[PDB]
């Protein structure tokens, strides 16, 4: 078979980033702390 392309991987990877954002690190982790962080210090 026509294994995909290398167009139809462009489609997974989009699908990447309109679905979680680029400020993932801060935003994520700090959330985190809000939760779990504060009640064990």
Same mark, same amino acid.
């Given at each position: ?7 139809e991987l462009w489609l997974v990877m989009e699908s #990447? ?7 993932? %690190?801060?935003?994520?982790? #700090? ?7 504060? %009640?064990?210090?």
């Amino acid at each position: 078979e026509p294994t995909l392309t290398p167009d139809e991987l462009w489609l997974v990877m989009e699908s #990447y980033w309109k679905e979680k954002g680029f400020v993932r %690190q801060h935003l994520d982790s #700090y959330n985190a702390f809000i939760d779990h962080g504060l %009640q064990d210090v």
